[PDB]
Amino acid sequence: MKGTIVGTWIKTLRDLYGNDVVDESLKSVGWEPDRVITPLEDIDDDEVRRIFAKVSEKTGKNVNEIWREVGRQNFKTFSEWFPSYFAGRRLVNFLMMMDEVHLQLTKMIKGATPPRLIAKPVAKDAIEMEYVSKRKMYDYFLGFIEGSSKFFKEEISVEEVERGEKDGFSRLKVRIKFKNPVFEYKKN
Numbered sequence: 001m002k003g004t005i006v007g008t009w010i011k012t013l014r015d016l017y018g019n020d021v022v023d024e025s026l027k028s029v030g031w032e033p034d035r036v037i038t039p040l041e042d043i044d045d046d047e048v049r050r051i052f053a054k055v056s057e058k059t060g061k062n063v064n065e066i067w068r069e070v071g072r073q074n075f076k077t078f079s080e081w082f083p084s085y086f087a088g089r090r091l092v093n094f095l096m097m098m099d100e101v102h103l104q105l106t107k108m109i110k111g112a113t114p115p116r117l118i119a120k121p122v123a124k125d126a127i128e129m130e131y132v133s134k135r136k137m138y139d140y141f142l143g144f145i146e147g148s149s150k151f152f153k154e155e156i157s158v159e160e161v162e163r164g165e166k167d168g169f170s171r172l173k174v175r176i177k178f179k180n181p182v183f184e185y186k187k188n
């Protein structure tokens with residue numbers, strides 16, 4: 001996992017559960033509690049997993065619930081640190097651009113393998129987005145979408161319609177519905 005994202009996870013964990021929970025969790029995997037994570041270094045996926053398991057242990061929270069909360073709050077943490085990607089006007093266009101943004105990172109950044117996020121308009125007020133990953137971060141994905149709403153200041157409802165694993169991939173399709181319409185039909 002790239003330092004960019006893991007660094008935001010560590011800060012977000014602190015904002016949610018405080019410095020002691022985090023310091024101990026990092027110490028438990030052999031990090032300095034005050035480790036400065038750089039954007040382009042690589043962090044072992046399993047060390048992140050063990051860190052989050054420690055947070056779970058020390059907070060009595062299910063890890064999936066932690067990931068859900070981290071997702072929501074991390075949208076803020078991440079958008080503040082990497083603003084270039086979060087300056088658009090409309091949530092819907094942001095969401096539609098995400099598959100290409102991730103694809104560009106896969107292409108151009110060594111060691112980066114973000115998930116597919118193919119989005120598809122399905123109604124004048126809704127899009128379908130499908131998370132497809134070799135990882136499985138269903139709850140983080142859900143929380144991050146929810147965090148995007150608070151940032152663009154646009155109300156949405158997020159409805160999960162499909163979940164499952166096939167051929168090595170975790171897959172989660174959500175239907176994102178906007179209070180106010182965002183598409184109109186146009187002749188082919």
Ligand code: HEM
Pocket residue numbers: 001002004005082085095098101102105111112113114115117132133134135136137140141144145148
């Ligand atoms: C609503 C918008 C977004 C969603 C839903 C989303 C979703 C995710 C998720 C769930 C992961 C965890 C990896 C996985 O589960 O497979 C991930 C990884 C990542 N994402 Fe995003 N993302 C969004 C926007 C962005 C933006 C704007 C950037 C700008 C650089 C970005 C950069 C990254 C990076 C660098 C990783 C780590 C990839 C790796 O370490 O292999 N994401 N994304």
